């Protein structure tokens, strides 16, 4: 009759009750008619099944007429149909247990551990909100440093669903790049999580950057890493950079400005292995604002040519759109307009303005 889905390793309780609110003889048996457990008077007799260790019941509820079956540390092989048997009639409850696990061959792989004969579909939403839908196995092909939060995968079989949450951590100096898109005036955050092997190890590093003008490459800061302690060697006055003393390599820019935009290289070396490690970082900045009757929206930094800028009212359609670096509207209709720099599928930057 009943249908229960479970998380692998979690604990679920199967509710059986009888009409008479008294202690009476009963037992449980699985799909193969194997005794799970029974009661002999006051005592509880254990069944011969391979579920012997984990399956259990609560004797507190036997007087009240409830006869629950408790299974802790669920396994996929536990998923089966179970039967509560009081000598008069039998109540039937079907159990499916799923599980989610993460492999790694930069790139990540997820496998959904499933019981036999199931027909499940699995959608998965990123921390930023990107949805990745798949079948029994999902593949996270390309990862950027920004999208490294707690991911949430919801698994659905027919009409019943189960939620899984798992963390993704993207290593900095691997081939994955870092990029941040900010509207003007916002504080900028860059994080470079270190691999657990080198986190204790010691080295030195610095960050080179290039602005709107390519005349000079500023080389913002030089810093030293000993034990798990980050100390700064030199900082430029121009960006008021903050380097975290704490071990997670954290760098903060006080507020985003157009001049503070462009590609950069962060280089970390280590006295141990003396092999130069590099990492690529980009910052793209949007300015969307109205001067008197004019409305102007420009974007600065290294953006792929393929993306497109648009100005549009949220009620109507795009009043102007080009794939260039700057967009301007004169005497625009009254309303709350918006400026978007976006690729084909998603909007990278959106700014909301009032005319």
């Amino acid at each position: 009759k009943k249908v229960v889905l479970g998380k692998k390793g979690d604990t679920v309780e199967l509710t059986c009750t009888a009409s008479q609110k008294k202690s009476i003889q009963f037992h449980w048996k699985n799909s193969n008619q194997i005794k799970i457990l029974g009661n002999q008077g006051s005592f509880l007799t254990k069944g011969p099944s391979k579920l012997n260790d984990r399956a259990d019941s609560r004797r507190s509820l036997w007087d009240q007429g409830n006869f629950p079956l408790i299974i802790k540390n669920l396994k996929i092989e536990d998923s089966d149909t179970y039967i509560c048997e009081v000598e008069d009639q039998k109540e039937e409850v079907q159990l499916l247990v799923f599980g989610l696990t993460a492999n790694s061959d930069q790139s990540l792989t997820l496998t959904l551990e499933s019981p036999p004969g199931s027909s499940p579909s699995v959608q998965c939403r990123s921390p930023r909100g990107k949805n990745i839908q798949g079948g029994k196995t999902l593949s996270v092909s390309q990862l950027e440093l920004q999208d490294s939060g707690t991911w949430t995968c919801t698994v659905l079989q027919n009409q019943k669903k189960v939620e899984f949450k798992i963390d993704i951590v993207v290593l900095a100096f691997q081939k994955a790049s870092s990029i941040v898109y900010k509207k003007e005036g916002e504080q900028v955050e860059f994080s470079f999580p270190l691999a657990f092997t080198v986190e204790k190890l010691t080295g030195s590093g610095e960050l080179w950057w290039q602005a709107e003008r390519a005349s000079s490459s500023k080389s913002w800061i030089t810093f030293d890493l000993k034990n798990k302690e980050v100390s700064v060697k030199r900082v430029t006055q121009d960006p008021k950079l903050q380097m975290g003393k704490k071990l997670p390599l954290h760098l903060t820019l006080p507020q985003a400005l157009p001049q503070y935009a462009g590609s950069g290289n962060l280089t970390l070396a280590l006295e141990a292995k003396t092999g130069k490690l590099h990492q690529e970082v980009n910052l793209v900045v949007m300015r969307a604002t109205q001067l008197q009757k004019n409305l102007t929206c420009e974007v600065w930094g290294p953006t792929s040519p393929k993306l497109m800028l648009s100005l549009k009212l949220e009620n109507k359609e795009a009043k102007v759109s080009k794939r260039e670096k700057a967009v301007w509207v004169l005497n625009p209709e009254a309303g709350m307009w918006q400026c978007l720099l976006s690729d084909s599928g998603q909007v990278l930057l959106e700014s909301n303005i009032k005319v």
Partner: antibody
Amino acid sequence: QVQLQQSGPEVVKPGASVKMSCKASGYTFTSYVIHWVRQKPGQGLDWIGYINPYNDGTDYDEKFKGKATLTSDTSTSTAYMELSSLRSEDTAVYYCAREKDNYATGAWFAYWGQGTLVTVSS
Amino acid sequence: DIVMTQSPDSLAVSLGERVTMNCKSSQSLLYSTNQKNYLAWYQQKPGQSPKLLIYWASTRESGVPDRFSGSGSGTDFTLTISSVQAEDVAVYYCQQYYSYRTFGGGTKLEIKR
């Protein structure tokens, strides 16, 4: 009396996509999983994919990971499948089927459609 | 995937005789918990769609007559037609539902008169 009725035969240009249909009647359309099978002329059955009508959940076989697209219209109670960039080989007969019961109790294809013949030609 | 293989290519059987049709799977289809084989058998008479014959590898559908019987366990399964009637000229397929859903190549049963 559970019926499964598919489209009629069709002609589709090479490279064009064919969207075919499968109309269900006699049960709660969102309560059981739908499957698609391809059979080429006088050849074995090739499993393609399965769609859950409840949320339009999707999983396909690797051979058809690009080609096969399964959607369902819950109101009309119909399941569709479309193949993209049809090739000469792809001329075949496609069936839609249903699981006997839900939640792994019955996963064998018990109720079947009549078949749709798509002649890939110009 | 799970590779299913059906032998023979085609079969010639005389009237009233006993039919044996084999389906061997890549990996096992037996589920340890509920001791059920996740395998099924199907008939397709010419010009028609396939028809369900055996589910769980040991049980037949209500419409199915009594002469068909399913046998085997694990990885080696067999369909047996007790006495071939003239009307059983068809091609029979086997399918697994343990993981995903894969079929066989097929055995054509032809009667020798």
